[PDB]
RNA sequence: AGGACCGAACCGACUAAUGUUGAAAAAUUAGCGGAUGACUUGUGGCUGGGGGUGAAAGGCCAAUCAAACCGGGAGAUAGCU
RNA sequence: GUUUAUUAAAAACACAGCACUGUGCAAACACGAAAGUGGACGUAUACGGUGUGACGCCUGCCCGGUGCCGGAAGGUUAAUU
RNA sequence: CUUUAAUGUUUGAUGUUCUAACGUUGACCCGUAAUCCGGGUUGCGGACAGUGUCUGGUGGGUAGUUUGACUGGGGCGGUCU
C-alpha cells in the first residue's frame with residue numbers, strides 16, 4: 001500500500017514520501033492516527049498545496065509521539081518530577097505529566113497516559129511505568145525517576 | 150461422622166450416611182434463595198443433550214457469594230447450612246454493617262468465627278485475599294482464574310489448591326487433579342480447605358438413593374442393538390471392537406482437549 | 421446472514437467432485453470479517469461485516485465512497 | 498426406621514378355563530405380583546420421522562413401526578402373474 | 579424394581595458397589611449451516627463415556643498383532659513455488 | 660568479465676519484545692428500574708487464537724451401491740476360452 005507520510009515515522013520516511021507500507025500497518029496504525037494517508041493521485045495533488053500548512057505549522061506544533069507507542073520509550077521525556085509515591089512502586093497514580101516540565105513546552109510536545117486503575121493491585125509486589133500503557137503487567141518496568149525520585 | 154445403618158432390610162444393608170450434628174436443622178435464609186427448575190438434561194431445542202438426568206427432589210438455589218468483593222468489613226459466621234445444590238456445606242455469615250451472605254464452609258469454620266476479605270486480612274481459614282498477598286506454599290480454595298470473575302477452582306467438598314510458585318504477574322497453582330497452572334496474581338482466593346471432606350465416604354446403598362439426586366439409569370452400549378450403539382448387538386454377549394462413545398468416538402485413552410487459547414497457562418498436564 | 425455489505429458476496433452452491441467424479445452439493449462461503457473502520461468524516465468507528473475483497477475495495481475507493489454506496493443502497497450500518 | 502412384611506382401594510398381568518363371524522380388533526371368571534415408593538394419578542407443557550423417546554424388547558411415537566401418517570414426483574419400475 | 583400395549587416377565591435390562599478413561603471451565607460431550615442452549619447458575623470428593631455388577635476370597639502371566647498414548651535421527655509425502 | 664567483503668535494501672527462517680488489527684462466556688458507565696444486544700472506559704490475552712478458500716491424512720459417524728452363471732433343488736465342491 002502506497003502512502004504519503006504526514007509526519008515522521010521511525011523506519012519509513014520523514015515529512016512526505018510515497019512509502020510502500022503493508023496494508024495492515026497502514027489500515028490499523030498509520031491512518032487511524034495522524035501519521036499518513038493513502039496516495040490515490042488526487043490526495044497527493046491536494047498534498048502539494050497542503051504542504052505549506054503541514055510542513056510548518058503542524059510540523060512545529062507536533063512532529064513526535066505520533067501514536068505515543070515507541071517515541072515515548074525512545075525520546076525520554078517528563079523525567080523531571082516532584083511526586084515520589086509510597087515506596088517506589090507506582091500503582092494507579094497518574095502523578096504529574098504536564099506541570100513541572102520544561103522540554104515538553106516548546107513546539108513538539110510528546111505526552112503520556114494513565115495506568116491500571118485500582119481493582120486488584122496495590123503498593124507492593126510490582127510497579128508501573130509513567131508512560132503510555134496498554135499492558136500493565138507484562139509491560140516494561142523500567143524506573144522513570146518518578147516512582148521514588 | 151459416618152454411620153453404617155444396620156441391615157434391617159436389603160437397601161439399608163449397605164447404606165452409610167454422613168451425619169453432621171452442627172448443621173442447621175431449620176429452614177434456609179429466605180432472601181438468599183431463588184427458584185431453580187430441573188431440566189431433565191434438555192436444552193432449548195427440547196432434546197436430551199446430556200443423558201441420565203431427570204427427577205430427584207425439588208431444590209431451591211442458594212445465592213452463594215463467590216466474588217467476596219465486600220472488603221474491609223469483618224463478618225461473623227451465624228450458622229452452617231446444608232446446600233442441596235453442591236457437595237460442600239455453606240455458611241450464613243453476618244457482616245458488621247448488617248448484611249447477610251452465604252459462603253462455602255472451610256474445613257475448620259464453626260459458628261461464631263470471624264472472617265474478612267481484602268488485602269489487609271489475616272492468614273487464617275475463611276479469609277479471602279489475592280494470591281499476591283497470600284504466601285507461597287499455602288493451601289487455598291474458591292480460587293479465581295481471572296480477577297473479579299468469582300472463584301471457580303477447588304469448590305467441591307474436600308478440595309483445595311496448593312500455591313507452588315510466584316513469578317511476576319502470575320502465580321503457579323497445583324490443582325486437585327494434579328495439573329500445574331498459571332493464574333494472575335490479582336486473582337482472589339480463600340484460605341483453608343473447603344470442608345465436609347467425608348462426602349466421599351457416603352455410599353448410596355440402593356438405586357432409589359441415586360434416583361433421589363436426579364440420576365436416571367445408565368444402559369450399557371453392549372445391551373443395545375446395532376442401530377442404537379456401535380457396541381450394538383451380536384448373538385449372546387459380543388463386543389469384538391474397540392470401546393467407543395454412542396457417537397463413535399474412541400473412549401479408553403483418546404484425549405479430547407483442543408483449546409489452543411488456554412494452553413499457555415498450563416505448565417504440566419495432570420499425570 | 422453471511423453477506424459482505426461492501427460487495428454483496430453470499431454463500432454460493434456448487435459441487436464437491438471426487439476422483440470418480442461423484443458430485444455432492446456444497447457451499448462456498450465468503451471470507452467475511454467484522455471490522456471497525458475509522459471514519460474521519462464523522463470521527464467515529466463504523467462496524468461493518470466485510471469480506472477481504474471488500475476490504476481491498478475500501479482501501480482502493482475510500483471508506484467515504486463505500487459508505488455513500490451503502491447508504492444509497494440502504495444497508496443500515 | 499425401612500425402595501421392610503400380610504392385605505383392600507389403586508397400579509399391574511404369572512396360570513387355567515371360556516371366548517376366537519367374541520359381550521370385547523386383547524376381554525370375562527377363578528386364582529396371581531406391588532401396594533410410602535425407582536409408587537400411582539389428574540391438568541397443562543416439551544422432544545417429530547434417518548428424527549424423537551427408550552431401567553434396551555428394535556420397544557413405543559393416535560388399533561399402523563428394522564424407519565409413522567397425509568399429499569406430491571407418479572400412470573416410478575415390474576425381462577413376472 | 580424394568581421389559582417385547584396385543585403369543586416371551588425371564589437367567590434379559592436396571593441397580594447400589596468397583597475399575598478404566600476423558601474433562602482446568604468459554605470443560606469434555608451433546609442439540610444446533612449459526613447465534614445460542616444443556617452439562618451447570620455445577621468446578622476434579624465435579625461432570626461425561628465405557629465395562630463389570632451387593633457382599634467374602636480374589637482378580638495370575640503376555641504389549642508379539644489391532645487400538646490408544648508419548649517421543650523421536652532419519653525415509654517417503656499435498657496444496658503452494 | 661573470473662572472485663569476493665557490506666549495507667539502505669526485497670522477500671526465507673528462529674527467537675524475544677510490542678500494540679493498533681482481532682478475542683474476552685473479566686470489571687465499571689450509559690441506552691435502561693434489562694444476566695440479551697450495542698456503545699464506552701479499563702484490565703487480560705494478541706498477530707496467537709479463530710473464520711474463508713485450497714490442501715495431505717483419518718473418517719461404517721452417514722450415504723449410494725456391488726457381491727456371476729452352470730448346476731438331476733440350492734449350497735459346499737467342480738467348471739467357464
Ligand SMILES: [Mg+2]
Pocket residue numbers: 200201367
Ligand atoms: Mg452418566
Ligand code: NA
Pocket residue numbers: 370371372380381382383386387388
Ligand atoms: Na454387542
